[PDB]
């Protein structure tokens, strides 16, 4: 009657590769980290912003995307653990969700890295408003 659950999917992922020639700063690797929906799902309907926390060696290490694409592209020396906050267009709780993203590079002369990590979010009894956003994004009713 009143109750519903809505699930949506996020994909966090990254690519990393060894540069053929280090940058003049001597950066050895290009990487790119992202949050996206699965194809035919528009997470922008319910995602306010994504906040990527780079290693504090990076200038302005707190990177915000308020619209898609939610990604950071960098060169650097090493991998690190990257906190990632996904903020929702929700007037209620919860307003966001945090992830500990493992941003690892290809050590030695390993082939380049191409990782994906699939996260299912479950929203219980969302407001009709926020519910409209979740379902618009390709969210699904369950329970
Ligand atoms: O690539 C990195 N930063 C790029 C950059 C840009 C501009 C200036 C400077 Cl100085 C650096 C970077 C990445 C990771 C790092 C790091 C720097 N220093 C320690 N770490 C963790 C190393 N630990 C990882 C697990 C064990 C060691």
UniProtKB/Swiss-Prot annotation:
This is Protein ENL. The chain holds residues 2 to 144 of 559 of the full protein. It is found in: Nucleus. The YEATS domain specifically recognizes and binds acylated histones, with a preference for histones that are crotonylated. Chromatin reader component of the super elongation complex (SEC), a complex required to increase the catalytic rate of RNA polymerase II transcription by suppressing transient pausing by the polymerase at multiple sites along the DNA. Specifically recognizes and binds acetylated and crotonylated histones, with a preference for histones that are crotonylated. Has a slightly higher affinity for binding histone H3 crotonylated at 'Lys-27' (H3K27cr) than 'Lys-20' (H3K9cr20). Acts as a key chromatin reader in acute myeloid leukemia by recognizing and binding to acetylated histones via its YEATS domain, thereby regulating oncogenic gene transcription. Residues 1-137 form the YEATS domain. It is linked to A chromosomal aberration involving MLLT1 is associated with acute leukemias. Translocation t(11;19)(q23;p13.3) with KMT2A/MLL1. The result is a rogue activator protein. The record marks 102 as: Acylated histone binding. Residues 55-57, 77-79 are annotated as: Acylated histone binding. Component of the super elongation complex (SEC), at least composed of EAF1, EAF2, CDK9, MLLT3/AF9, AFF (AFF1 or AFF4), the P-TEFb complex and ELL (ELL, ELL2 or ELL3). Interacts with ALKBH4. Component of a SWI/SNF-like EBAFb complex, at least composed of SMARCA4/BRG1/BAF190A, SMARCB1/BAF47/SNF5, ACTL6A/BAF53A, SMARCE1/BAF57, SMARCD1/BAF60A, SMARCD2/BAF60B, SMARCC1/BAF155, SMARCC2/BAF170, ARID1B/BAF250B, MLLT1/ENL and actin.
């Amino acid at each position: 009657d009143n109750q519903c659950t809505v699930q949506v999917r996020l994909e966090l992922g990254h690519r990393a590769q060894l540069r053929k020639k280090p940058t003049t700063e001597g950066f050895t690797h290009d990487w790119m980290v992202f949050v996206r929906g699965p194809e035919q799902c528009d997470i922008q309907h319910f995602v306010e912003k994504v906040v990527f926390w780079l290693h504090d060696s990076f200038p302005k290490p707190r990177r915000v995307c308020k619209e898609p694409p939610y990604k950071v592209e960098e060169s650097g020396y090493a991998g690190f653990i990257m906190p990632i906050e996904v903020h929702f267009k929700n007037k209620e709780e919860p307003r966001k969700v945090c992830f500990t993203y493992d941003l690892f590079l290809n050590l030695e002369g390993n082939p380049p890295v191409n990782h994906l990590r699939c996260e299912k979010l479950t929203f219980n009894n969302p407001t009709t408003e926020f519910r409209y956003k979740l379902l618009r994004a390709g969210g699904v009713m369950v329970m």
